[PDB]
Amino acid sequence: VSMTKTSVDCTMYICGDSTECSNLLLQYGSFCTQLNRALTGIAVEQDKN
Amino acid sequence: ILDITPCSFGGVSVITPGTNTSNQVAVLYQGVNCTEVPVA
Ligand SMILES: *[C@@H]1O[C@H](CO)[C@@H](O[C@@H]2O[C@H](CO)[C@@H](O)[C@H](O)[C@H]2NC(C)=O)[C@H](O)[C@H]1NC(C)=O
Ligand SMILES: *[C@@H]1O[C@H](CO)[C@@H](O)[C@H](O)[C@H]1NC(C)=O
């Protein structure tokens, strides 16, 4: 019927607690939002199911 | 020997009626024993 809802904190997975990294990740734009989106959309539809 | 626990974190989800109702909001710190949040 469902699976364990997961939010992966994208920027903290990519590089935990470095701005020296985070300001480079920002040059890639939308990807780290669209990942968080997707995973939230899948988590939300578990409650739907 | 010291063990490192990484400093606590989580999703923050904001709880709101419509803004067409009120600017009052509540806030959830996902998976946090928030006895630590006022200390921050
Ligand atoms: C929230 O975290 C605190 C630790 O800061 C937990 O408190 C412990 O609870 C057990 C059971 O009551 C006691 O034996 C310990 O002595 C407590 N320690 C302190 C410092 O209070 C608390 O149980 C946690 N609660 C939840 C719901 O996560
Ligand atoms: C806001 O809600 C009220 C009813 O509570 C409604 O009359 C009003 O049309 C809503 N606002 C807008 C911008 O439509």
Curated annotation (Swiss-Prot), chain A:
Cysteine-cysteine disulfides: C10-C32, C15-C21
Superkingdom of source: Viruses
Function in brief: Precursor of the fusion protein processed in the biosynthesis of the S protein and the formation of virus particle. Mediates fusion of the virion and cellular membranes by functioning as a class I viral fusion protein. Contains two viral fusion peptides that are unmasked after cleavage. The S2/S2' cleavage occurs during virus entry at the cell membrane by host TMPRSS2 or during endocytosis by host CSTL.
Protein name: Spike protein S2
The gene coding this protein: S
From Swiss-Prot, chain B:
Protein name from the UniProt record: Spike protein S1
Subunit structure: Binds to host ACE2. RBD also interacts with the N-linked glycan on 'Asn-90' of ACE2. Cleavage of S generates a polybasic C-terminal sequence on S1 that binds to host Neuropilin-1 (NRP1) and Neuropilin-2 (NRP2) receptors. Interacts with host integrin alpha-5/beta-1 (ITGA5:ITGB1) and with ACE2 in complex with integrin alpha-5/beta-1 (ITGA5:ITGB1). May interact via cytoplasmic c-terminus with M protein. May interact (via N-terminus) with host bilirubin and biliverdin, thereby preventing antibody binding to the SARS-CoV-2 spike NTD via an allosteric mechanism.
Glycan attachment residues as annotated in the record: N20, N33
Result for mutant: Q30H: In strain: A23.1
Biological role stated in the UniProt entry: Attaches the virion to the cell membrane by interacting with host receptor, initiating the infection. The major receptor is host ACE2. When S2/S2' has been cleaved, binding to the receptor triggers direct fusion at the cell membrane. When S2/S2' has not been cleaved, binding to the receptor results in internalization of the virus by endocytosis using host TFRC and GRM2 and leading to fusion of the virion membrane with the host endosomal membrane. Alternatively, may use NRP1/NRP2 and integrin as entry receptors.
Residues included from the entire protein: 584 to 623 of 1273
Superkingdom, taxonomy of origin: Viruses
